[PDB]
Ligand binder design. Structure first.
Ligand SMILES: NC(=O)c1ccc[n+]([C@@H]2O[C@H](COP(=O)([O-])OP(=O)(O)OC[C@H]3O[C@@H](n4cnc5c(N)ncnc54)[C@H](O)[C@@H]3O)[C@@H](O)[C@H]2O)c1
Ligand SMILES: NC(=O)c1ccc[n+]([C@@H]2O[C@H](COP(=O)([O-])OP(=O)(O)OC[C@H]3O[C@@H](n4cnc5c(N)ncnc54)[C@H](O)[C@@H]3O)[C@@H](O)[C@H]2O)c1
Lengths: 376, 379
């Protein structure tokens, strides 16, 4: 509207990593008012996406970020290649949006957050599950006291992956971190719901059914047992060797419970002997579409993993728009909502990777691990 | 049966030690079995009443009871902490033993009970009655038949919401019941049956999160167990009484498919090769649906599901008690023990259940992962 003048500067975005997710974030951000995609860097797919978005290609991160028209960057490289794009952005005074998992070590994540703070640039952690209607609603119910004190969260993200003709980087521990880091969404969600990191974790599991030359080396079953301060608990399950598919977050408090189901897609509140239902995504059509995708891909979860040339489904495209609108607002000086502030302070980024590192160490060293061992 | 069953059957004389909710009903059931007689009961509070109902004698002393010429076997249905002396003294008198779960509240006790019965050459049947559920027998058949391939992972839950009762049952006193883990050991025994024995290593976490008014009972109301089995296999087991999202099931996941035994929304599911099949957990669709009705009635307070003297087990439980008492009576009339039930007679399922429960307990109290070798040694 006419009243927007004063607030509608064009923010120039770079995209580093324009595959499945980076190309689609670029498509979405290009459509946002006051945003332009000026340049992309992606050795394999940059030329193709630059032609689609009508923007430039760069090949060197310092050259890209030295451009006067590059003010912000969306970092959507593979999980193991987030650090250099973020560090060099901060060194050039470029504002950062970074895909999950922020990094595959706490040291990397800590350095990325710290370097952005030292250079006075924004660092937004792309923990997109926080934008789900169902998650926002669960947090509101908790804040409103509807389920009393949260005692216990149980998450699962369990399916069956068939042998593929090729092994994606997403299946290789050194490149993806495996399920715990690639699917860190659930861990971050539980930490948001329970008010931070646990004190101590145990993780068990292994590669039970995907060992050999035709498979990646990631664990295909992971089971986390978290002990929080003040006598509270969480159980988190992941993997790719489960012929009983489950994907949900279950929240149990002194007065009620909340389930966010992403397989039979929908939210349930139990309180005082009644049930209420709520949407996980932004419409019944989005929830029902997600249900159809899970039912259609039951015999092989590998089909849900993005790769260059593929497009995110309806529910994911829709929340990516919400998240890119939120980022664009922050970069046009809209005040950070309390609810999402931990995605900008570094607190959620550090907490997610600290706990993931503690779980990893617990599983590989076969012992309980205190978060203090990771964070100091 | 068969043509060979013609002729009078030898009567086996049964004692019952503990005739509360469960012992009184086991007596009613065994009395109806051919070739079985209930001859005497010992129960300080309820023995006179149950003996009048079953038309049998009352004893007050275990050695006197077992020295009776007519006592050949005993059903031990005392509270969880009072199983050892009735079993040991039965064995010392050459009396065959059926013992309620949990066999005992320590591995030392359980092991001594098994060893003493072996020393005296008497039968010792572990009353792990969940092995007599139609849906558990069917799940085992599917697994043995290779339908779901190698079992990789079992997940059990037995989670509800219990209100504090005006007066506290022995079942809520940890030294008397052993708390959820031992009083509801059914799920732990079920997982170990399906995964072929004890795990190598366990972790248990939990606490009294919502029953601070009952802290004197020293029981956790939430328990979470993480089991690591040999050859890269796992289990997760949940229990407790502070869960406003009720769940009671055993989920079995293998290389080729999965089986769920649901005891809340009562029914079995097989998932394999892109299809689902339904099967019964109990003896009929009516028994499953009755169990579902019971769980809907107890959702706001699971405390009402606990038996106490004067109460009768529900239909599904009466049915498996009949299955189990018929099995026991057959063994005591010289029927050969099936491979399926043999671990209930060898001591192996009894020792495995209590060994793992003790390891879980130690893990929770010491706040660390515990190897089963700490309990059982290096073999
Ligand atoms: N919902 C979500 O938040 C969501 C979903 C999918 C993926 N992701 C995240 O998005 C990121 C990318 O995953 P994806 O699904 O797009 O993977 P993808 O394999 O589809 O794309 C990765 C792209 O990175 C490019 N690339 C590789 N090395 C590079 C380098 N050095 N510099 C620049 N580009 C490089 C590749 O050429 C490719 O185009 C990861 O962090 C992943 O975890 C997030
Ligand atoms: N397998 C199952 O499905 C199932 C279900 C319920 C109970 N049980 C088991 O049955 C046993 C008894 O539980 P319950 O539900 O009947 O409890 P209950 O409280 O109803 O009955 C316990 C009985 O033990 C008697 N008793 C107490 N001390 C005794 C002693 N020293 N000698 C003899 N009798 C004594 C009491 O008088 C009472 O009659 C326990 O092992 C319990 O775990 C098993």
């Amino acid at each position: 509207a006419m009243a927007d003048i004063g607030s509608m500067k064009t923010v120039g975005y770079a995209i580093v990593g324009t595959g499945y997710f980076g190309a689609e974030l670029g498509r979405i951000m290009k459509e946002q008012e006051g945003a332009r995609i000026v340049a992309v860097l992606d050795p394999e797919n940059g030329q193709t996406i630059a032609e689609e978005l009508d923007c430039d290609v760069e090949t060197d991160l310092d050259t890209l970020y030295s451009r006067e028209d590059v003010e912000a960057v969306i970092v959507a490289t593979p999980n193991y290649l987030h650090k250099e794009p973020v560090i060099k952005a901060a060194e050039h005074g470029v504002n950062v949006f970074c895909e999950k998992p922020i990094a595959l070590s706490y040291q990397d994540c800590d350095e990325m957050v710290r370097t952005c703070q030292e250079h006075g640039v924004i660092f937004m952690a792309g923990h997109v599950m926080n934008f789900f209607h169902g998650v926002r609603y669960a947090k509101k119910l908790i804040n409103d006291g509807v389920i009393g004190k949260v005692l216990y969260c149980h998450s699962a993200r369990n399916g069956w992956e068939e042998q593929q003709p090729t092994i994606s980087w997403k299946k290789i521990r050194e490149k993806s971190g495996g399920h715990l880091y690639h699917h860190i969404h659930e861990l971050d969600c539980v930490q948001f719901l329970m008010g931070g990191m646990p004190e101590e974790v145990t993780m068990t599991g292994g590669n039970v059914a995907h060992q050999g030359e035709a498979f990646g080396d990631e664990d295909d079953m992971l089971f986390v047992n978290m002990q929080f301060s003040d006598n509270r608990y969480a159980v988190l399950e992941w993997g790719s060797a489960f012929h009983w598919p489950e994907h949900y977050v279950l929240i149990q408090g002194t007065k009620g419970a909340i389930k966010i189901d992403m397989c039979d897609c929908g939210g349930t509140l139990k309180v005082d002997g009644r049930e209420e239902h709520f949407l996980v995504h932004e419409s019944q059509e989005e929830d029902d579409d997600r249900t159809r995708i899970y039912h259609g891909t039951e015999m092989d979860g590998a089909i849900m993993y993005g790769k260059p040339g593929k497009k995110p489904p309806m529910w994911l495209h829709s929340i990516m728009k919400n998240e890119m609108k939120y980022l664009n607002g922050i970069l046009h000086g809209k005040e950070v909502d309390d609810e999402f502030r931990p995605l900008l302070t570094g607190e959620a980024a550090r907490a997610a990777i600290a706990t993931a590192d503690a779980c990893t160490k617990s599983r590989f060293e076969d012992r309980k691990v205190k978060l203090s061992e990771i964070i100091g």
